[PDB]
Amino acid sequence: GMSNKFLGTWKLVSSENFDDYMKALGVGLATRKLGNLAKPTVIISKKGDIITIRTESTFKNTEISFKLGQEFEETTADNRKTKSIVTLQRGSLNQVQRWDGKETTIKRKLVNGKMVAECKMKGVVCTRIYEKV
Numbered sequence: 001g002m003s004n005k006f007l008g009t010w011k012l013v014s015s016e017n018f019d020d021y022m023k024a025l026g027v028g029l030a031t032r033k034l035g036n037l038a039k040p041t042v043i044i045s046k047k048g049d050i051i052t053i054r055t056e057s058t059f060k061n062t063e064i065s066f067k068l069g070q071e072f073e074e075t076t077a078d079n080r081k082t083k084s085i086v087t088l089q090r091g092s093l094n095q096v097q098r099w100d101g102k103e104t105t106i107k108r109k110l111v112n113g114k115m116v117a118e119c120k121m122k123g124v125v126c127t128r129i130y131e132k133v
């Protein structure tokens, strides 16, 4: 189901509109500044049917592990506690995070060998491109 082409180590090379996304999330200024400077490495691995996404940066490291279609609790890098679910749709790995009464999505898709993460919260859309390394 999940392309084994997602598996590996990915390095952020381009980020667009991420400041606005973080602002939408209520991330404060000092954290936004560091957040915008970060160029995370994302490591995607699979163990059976459990996918792990590890995000590594000087500022913050996060790690989520899940099975597709199974709701899980996540503590995000900005310390939201969300109820999250990851599914595949059309080859894209779609992550929905819900908390209080909000929702944000992170879609990860492979585009010509690169991984493109689109982060969306209502009208705010970020695009983050990663290179496989």
Ligand SMILES: CCCCCCCCCCCCCCCC(=O)O
Pocket: 022, 025, 027, 031, 034, 035, 036, 038, 040, 042, 055, 057, 059, 060, 076, 077, 078, 106, 117, 119, 128
């Ligand atoms: C991601 C490391 C930087 C940390 C910035 C801290 C607050 C950011 C809010 C969390 C959003 C994470 C969005 C991830 C999208 C992606 O994988 O590229």
